[PDB]
Design a protein around this ligand. Sequence first.
Ligand SMILES: [Cl-]
Ligand SMILES: [Cl-]
Ligand code: NA
Length: 129
Amino acid sequence: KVFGRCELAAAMKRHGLDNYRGYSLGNWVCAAKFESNFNTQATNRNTDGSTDYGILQINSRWWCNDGRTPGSRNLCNIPCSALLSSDITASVNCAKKIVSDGNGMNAWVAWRNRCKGTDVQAWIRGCRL
Ligand SMILES: [Cl-]
Ligand SMILES: [Cl-]
Ligand code: NA
């Protein structure tokens, strides 16, 4: 599924991401925009053989099992394919674990490079939330 910006904002809000670990909702929308272009089916192979999955591009190196990242962990205890669902529950639940992991949203390269230190509230402007 390709979400609209306010559609995804609403879903992220419903799933308790707004201000989760102190990150306002616009942070999560901005991260999703640049990670996946709001596409829940987005996948990207990393140089090390791991793969990032779904709307928040969660990495198989640590967070989910895809059966092809030797040596990796599965800290969200899910198949990576669960992160590609039209329903973002699995992605949000996993994101909450990632953002709790020590480096906060810096875990998301796109967030650090393209969202952090910018007017992220702009991502939720005009949405009925
Ligand atoms: Cl694996
Ligand atoms: Cl933080
Ligand atoms: Na894994």
